[PDB]
Amino acid sequence: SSTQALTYLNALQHSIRLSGVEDHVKNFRPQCLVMTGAPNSRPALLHLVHDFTKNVGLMICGHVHMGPRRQAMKEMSIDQAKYQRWLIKNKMKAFYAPVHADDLREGAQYLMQAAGLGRMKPNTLVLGFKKDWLQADMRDVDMYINLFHDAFDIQYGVVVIRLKEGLKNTIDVWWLFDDGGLTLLIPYLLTTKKKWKDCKIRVFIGGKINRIDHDRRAMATLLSKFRIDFSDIMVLGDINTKPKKENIIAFEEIIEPYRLHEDDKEQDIADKMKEDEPWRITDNELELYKTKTYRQIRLNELLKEHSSTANIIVMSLPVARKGAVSSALYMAWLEALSKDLPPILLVRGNHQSVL
Amino acid sequence: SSTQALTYLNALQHSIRLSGVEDHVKNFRPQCLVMTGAPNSRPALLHLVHDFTKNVGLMICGHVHMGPRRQAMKEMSIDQAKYQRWLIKNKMKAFYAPVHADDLREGAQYLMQAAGLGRMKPNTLVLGFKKDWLQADMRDVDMYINLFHDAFDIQYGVVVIRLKEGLKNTIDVWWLFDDGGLTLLIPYLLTTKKKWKDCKIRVFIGGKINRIDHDRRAMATLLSKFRIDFSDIMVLGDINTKPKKENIIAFEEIIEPYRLHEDDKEQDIADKMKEDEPWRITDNELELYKTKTYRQIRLNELLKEHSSTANIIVMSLPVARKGAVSSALYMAWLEALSKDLPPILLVRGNHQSVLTF
Ligand SMILES: NS(=O)(=O)c1cc(C(=O)O)c(NCc2ccco2)cc1Cl
Ligand SMILES: NS(=O)(=O)c1cc(C(=O)O)c(NCc2ccco2)cc1Cl
């Protein structure tokens, strides 16, 4: 009170010192940019992202305020004061970062390219899964997926937390493809927080039916390199199998409102809808990506079968080339992958290795 | 040591400590981002902006990088490492913050909107004068003035400085407009440094013929509030008078290439070329703003005669409504106000630094 200048000067001096360093490859140091609507909303997501980003990296709770430009400054100021007070009340090492933008994409770009000083710049983007995508306008879903792809453009690592907001054995990990160390680094950082200390990492991977021993040995060596006391590596070959009849029926029902039946409908009408409504899922997309959808459905049913009784499932996030797949189908894949499981955490880190 | 995590986490906890303090509104401090593309170019500008930001605020030497997205990140990181090494080589406490944008205005918007974290966020926009704007495409000058107007829109202070790139004692302060005190805060911070100890702040005012004592005591008490310790407080009544004809014709010659003499030329051609080049200066603009231009020229004359020798000249910055003046006319005003002087530092601030430092 009246002598905060000392704190400010100390912070500035330490930040300059930190910027003094020159080597970044050695330490990945996960810095998270959490894109939640407001810190008060989605408290569970905030706690879970804070768990693995606390004393091991900062977290910037971003907020893209959008509205009339005239009174934007006063609204943003009152919001910053209120949300910072709330966010310190529920002790969190998180910085509230509000910006003004005409839409979520622009504000996300502001936060993703400008937030932070020197070395304290976010390098992963954390999004809560858009649970209301079915009832939401599909333009906003397109914007959500385009935000994923913008993150992948700036060499960010995308984390998607799907968590049941209506609210002690193991922490399953479903490492499938390389990414980096991030997918395996999130469980390591989770385990050392004294809240998940009594939780045991039960890694999973896919492999050939004639190579369980060799794959297990190699993955155990990698885990020892990551030194996360892996309990066991349940190498599976069940991937790439027709899931079931009921599961495929459920997925078809999910995507039915957005499917485009070009063959059933007249070609001119199909083109008209595509031009005036480009997020419609064409049948060509389904035919091309039928194996990928089978992979998603099979992975979901495997998660239910093996990892039902797990606290935090960590899985690798499916991705597709920008524009190669309709946004509606992409969110359908994300819905199917994480359907009725415990708090699940889809991760795709950047190519550069964490350590 | 070869480890940095100790510094990183300590800096974190300090930043969280800072953000936790309920500073209310009584924590104004000059936090400026120096929008200059190449920190190697214009070292004098960085040194000057560093003099009054050494230990009272941060300096985010922003930089917008233009090019293809593919290899944008690689060269951006290369430049970041290079320029941070350069800044550390010199004794500058500046964070080199680069962003990628299609145009300078968009990257500047990124920086001004989202740069910084917590309460160590930028507060003013230091802008090196766009010297050689005569030879530069006028789209560039349009963006340059739009930067001023964006900064004013987002409640930022704007300071533009016209250092000579080639690089008794007194610091002149022309407190002409009440902008919240930043014009007076910059000189105070300058003086309280090893270089400007022999400061001798000399303060000038603009007032009509009246009792000099009134304004004299007014600025005496104002500077006592600001702890300026003036060497002299002067009031000038020559402002807002017709300047010499030579300067007027010189100014008219400066804007001659960009002027739209629509009254002299045929109306259809004038309208067509106005539509082709919306930055052209119409004659109606000059007629409306003849008094403003005369003030801008008389002020340059006045500070040339009164303040020919002075290490720093800190003046209130001219402002115009968004779009009322063509960018060429605004830039011509700024160029005529600081035509041939020592380091001149035109300042304007959001009306919030009310004895708050
Ligand atoms: N998780 S989400 O896609 O549904 C989401 C949702 C929101 C959201 O709109 O709450 C958001 N912030 C934008 C905003 C505008 C006004 C207040 O916050 C960000 C995200 Cl990622
Ligand atoms: N001080 S300035 O207006 O002349 C200026 C100057 C520059 C600059 O060009 O150095 C700049 N950014 C870098 C850049 C890249 C391409 C065009 O500009 C930004 C600004 Cl504000």
Side-chain angles (χ1 to χ4, degrees):
Chain A
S1 304
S2 194
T3 47
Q4 69 275 17
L6 300 84
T7 70
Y8 182 54
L9 294 174
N10 288 121
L12 170 61
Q13 294 285 359
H14 287 106
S15 302
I16 301 151
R17 279 269 284 150
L18 163 56
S19 309
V21 309
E22 52 81 16
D23 272 334
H24 74 289
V25 292
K26 162 60 199 173
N27 272 316
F28 174 84
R29 186 52 39 65
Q31 299 106 348
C32 274
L33 197 151
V34 187
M35 291 285 328
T36 58
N40 64 7
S41 58
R42 313 170 152 282
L45 167 50
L46 268 297
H47 281 290
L48 183 62
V49 63
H50 171 260
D51 279 304
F52 77 82
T53 306
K54 175 213 182 62
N55 295 319
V56 65
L58 79 165
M59 83 176 262
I60 304 184
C61 190
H63 179 98
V64 176
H65 178 279
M66 64 184 73
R69 176 67 258 203
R70 274 268 64 189
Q71 57 248 29
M73 302 307 313
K74 71 163 271 292
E75 286 185 355
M76 287 219 292
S77 76
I78 62 172
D79 268 358
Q80 181 174 2
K82 162 169 53 175
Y83 287 137
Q84 197 72 53
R85 187 166 313 99
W86 175 97
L87 181 141
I88 299 298
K89 191 179 56 52
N90 290 318
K91 44 192 191 163
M92 272 156 199
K93 315 298 199 57
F95 302 110
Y96 180 75
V99 299
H100 198 84
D102 305 335
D103 55 357
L104 182 63
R105 269 272 301 289
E106 282 180 343
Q109 193 69 351
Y110 296 0
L111 276 297
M112 293 177 71
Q113 280 198 357
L117 308 162
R119 287 291 209 282
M120 293 182 286
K121 264 183 54 49
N123 65 339
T124 71
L125 176 86
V126 170
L127 303 103
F129 185 80
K130 197 183 195 317
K131 302 178 193 65
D132 63 352
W133 77 287
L134 294 173
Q135 303 91 303
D137 190 10
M138 201 65 28
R139 300 184 290 88
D140 189 45
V141 163
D142 294 319
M143 185 179 288
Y144 189 82
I145 304 311
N146 300 321
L147 175 52
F148 282 10
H149 279 123
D150 282 0
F152 291 132
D153 278 14
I154 305 168
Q155 293 179 356
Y156 269 46
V158 179
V159 180
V160 193
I161 315 291
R162 198 219 174 93
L163 188 153
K164 316 169 282 180
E165 213 67 50
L167 274 74
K168 59 187 285 293
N169 304 125
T170 53
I171 285 166
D172 305 346
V173 177
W174 281 76
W175 162 284
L176 297 191
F177 63 91
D178 183 75
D179 291 331
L182 175 54
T183 185
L184 291 169
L185 189 147
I186 300 306
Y188 179 74
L189 270 57
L190 276 163
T191 47
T192 69
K193 313 310 304 208
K194 191 257 283 180
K195 185 186 240 184
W196 315 91
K197 194 87 90 162
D198 54 356
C199 295
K200 184 182 61 73
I201 302 187
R202 192 164 90 256
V203 188
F204 295 77
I205 64 182
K208 308 297 182 180
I209 300 289
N210 56 47
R211 203 72 160 273
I212 296 89
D213 57 356
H214 187 273
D215 277 353
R216 191 187 289 247
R217 221 71 61 89
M219 172 75 168
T221 53
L222 181 44
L223 267 290
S224 70
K225 280 172 47 53
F226 277 107
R227 58 159 90 167
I228 79 178
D229 65 88
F230 64 110
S231 174
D232 47 354
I233 312 177
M234 293 180 183
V235 182
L236 321 173
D238 274 317
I239 309 313
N240 305 114
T241 305
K242 216 178 203 304
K244 284 196 175 65
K245 173 59 149 292
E246 51 265 58
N247 284 43
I248 303 291
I249 282 292
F251 187 91
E252 292 286 16
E253 195 287 308
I254 278 172
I255 63 169
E256 177 47 35
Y258 323 110
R259 268 187 71 218
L260 190 66
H261 304 91
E262 301 151 0
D263 46 357
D264 307 344
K265 301 196 272 282
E266 303 80 7
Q267 273 313 340
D268 55 354
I269 306 304
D271 311 300
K272 178 196 299 155
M273 293 180 183
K274 286 184 287 187
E275 299 325 315
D276 64 46
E277 190 170 275
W279 47 264
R280 286 307 200 95
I281 308 169
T282 61
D283 290 287
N284 313 136
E285 275 162 29
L286 275 297
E287 281 326 290
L288 288 189
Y289 294 128
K290 186 44 151 165
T291 184
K292 205 168 179 84
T293 310
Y294 280 177
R295 184 177 176 87
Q296 304 316 326
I297 303 279
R298 181 51 158 159
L299 278 161
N300 186 359
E301 79 182 15
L302 268 173
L303 295 194
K304 274 199 282 291
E305 285 178 12
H306 288 56
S307 181
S308 173
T309 77
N311 278 124
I312 300 297
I313 306 174
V314 173
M315 169 154 275
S316 286
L317 175 79
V319 286
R321 214 161 281 91
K322 186 181 191 306
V325 61
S326 189
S327 79
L329 184 53
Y330 193 82
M331 291 285 318
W333 290 344
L334 292 176
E335 182 65 26
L337 188 48
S338 51
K339 190 180 285 184
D340 283 297
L341 306 169
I344 184 167
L345 189 140
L346 290 77
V347 172
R348 170 172 185 102
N350 203 232
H351 293 337
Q352 303 104 40
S353 64
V354 298
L355 288 178
Chain B
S1 174
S2 193
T3 64
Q4 45 274 21
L6 183 63
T7 57
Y8 184 94
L9 302 154
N10 175 31
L12 259 63
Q13 55 166 59
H14 272 87
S15 292
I16 294 90
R17 297 255 182 69
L18 162 57
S19 69
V21 70
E22 172 57 37
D23 57 348
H24 301 282
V25 71
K26 264 288 176 181
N27 195 11
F28 180 89
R29 296 182 86 84
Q31 300 161 92
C32 62
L33 73 165
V34 179
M35 201 84 59
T36 290
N40 314 117
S41 74
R42 308 219 278 294
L45 183 150
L46 287 177
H47 271 94
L48 183 64
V49 60
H50 170 66
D51 284 327
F52 73 84
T53 303
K54 209 194 156 296
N55 290 321
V56 290
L58 75 164
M59 219 182 72
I60 309 195
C61 185
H63 183 192
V64 306
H65 167 280
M66 293 180 183
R69 295 306 321 281
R70 200 81 288 178
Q71 72 274 30
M73 283 309 308
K74 270 78 77 177
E75 71 204 292
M76 189 161 294
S77 75
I78 292 295
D79 288 332
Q80 200 278 350
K82 185 202 320 174
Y83 295 152
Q84 191 67 44
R85 294 264 57 76
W86 181 90
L87 289 160
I88 295 298
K89 173 188 291 155
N90 306 53
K91 293 183 177 182
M92 311 215 178
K93 294 177 169 22
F95 312 100
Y96 174 82
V99 308
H100 188 94
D102 291 331
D103 50 346
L104 163 58
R105 197 186 176 180
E106 183 178 1
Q109 191 64 11
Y110 293 3
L111 275 299
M112 306 175 33
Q113 282 274 27
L117 72 173
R119 304 191 201 310
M120 65 184 74
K121 212 182 286 291
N123 216 356
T124 78
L125 175 87
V126 178
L127 271 170
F129 197 76
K130 196 194 196 315
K131 299 183 184 69
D132 291 331
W133 60 277
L134 279 297
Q135 289 71 242
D137 183 338
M138 191 75 38
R139 268 54 199 176
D140 302 334
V141 181
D142 280 328
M143 294 183 286
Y144 184 57
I145 304 309
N146 284 335
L147 282 174
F148 296 162
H149 287 115
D150 287 2
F152 296 141
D153 291 331
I154 196 167
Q155 270 158 43
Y156 277 20
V158 166
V159 305
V160 305
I161 64 172
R162 194 186 160 88
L163 281 293
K164 181 65 71 190
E165 191 49 36
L167 278 293
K168 195 86 91 163
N169 299 349
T170 185
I171 295 176
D172 294 330
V173 187
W174 298 67
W175 193 83
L176 293 155
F177 164 77
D178 188 16
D179 60 354
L182 184 56
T183 309
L184 292 165
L185 180 47
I186 296 297
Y188 165 46
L189 304 153
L190 290 152
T191 61
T192 306
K193 298 292 175 67
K194 304 152 211 173
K195 268 168 73 64
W196 317 96
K197 283 316 306 163
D198 50 351
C199 51
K200 195 183 319 167
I201 284 172
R202 197 172 47 226
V203 185
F204 299 163
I205 312 295
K208 302 186 177 181
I209 186 66
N210 82 313
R211 60 218 168 283
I212 309 303
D213 66 355
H214 163 255
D215 292 326
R216 281 251 185 184
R217 310 314 150 185
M219 281 286 268
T221 182
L222 201 44
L223 272 75
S224 81
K225 290 179 144 213
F226 283 66
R227 320 174 156 67
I228 290 282
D229 291 331
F230 61 95
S231 172
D232 278 322
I233 290 162
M234 185 180 288
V235 293
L236 294 174
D238 291 331
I239 295 165
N240 204 305
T241 195
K242 179 78 163 28
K244 294 188 185 296
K245 175 53 61 172
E246 293 86 1
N247 294 296
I248 297 169
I249 62 166
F251 179 81
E252 296 286 340
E253 171 166 350
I254 278 180
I255 57 172
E256 192 62 26
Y258 316 104
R259 221 182 88 169
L260 181 85
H261 64 279
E262 81 273 3
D263 289 334
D264 283 318
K265 76 167 68 63
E266 203 274 333
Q267 61 90 0
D268 207 319
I269 299 296
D271 295 0
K272 182 176 174 66
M273 182 179 72
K274 163 60 72 173
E275 301 326 327
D276 287 329
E277 296 164 358
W279 52 261
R280 282 295 181 119
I281 313 169
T282 75
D283 304 330
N284 185 38
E285 284 191 19
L286 278 298
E287 303 211 62
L288 284 192
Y289 303 147
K290 192 62 65 64
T291 184
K292 191 78 175 297
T293 287
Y294 283 174
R295 181 198 183 70
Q296 297 304 327
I297 300 167
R298 185 69 186 107
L299 200 56
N300 181 51
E301 291 197 296
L302 206 65
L303 63 84
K304 202 173 280 285
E305 66 183 1
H306 273 78
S307 171
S308 175
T309 181
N311 304 327
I312 301 299
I313 298 172
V314 183
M315 185 177 338
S316 287
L317 176 79
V319 174
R321 205 73 46 82
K322 194 186 186 315
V325 285
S326 87
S327 311
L329 185 58
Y330 199 107
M331 193 84 247
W333 282 348
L334 261 65
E335 202 295 328
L337 177 59
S338 49
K339 189 138 56 179
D340 294 326
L341 274 298
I344 176 157
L345 188 140
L346 301 98
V347 165
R348 187 180 193 86
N350 52 327
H351 295 88
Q352 320 200 331
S353 166
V354 182
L355 73 164
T356 300
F357 199 50

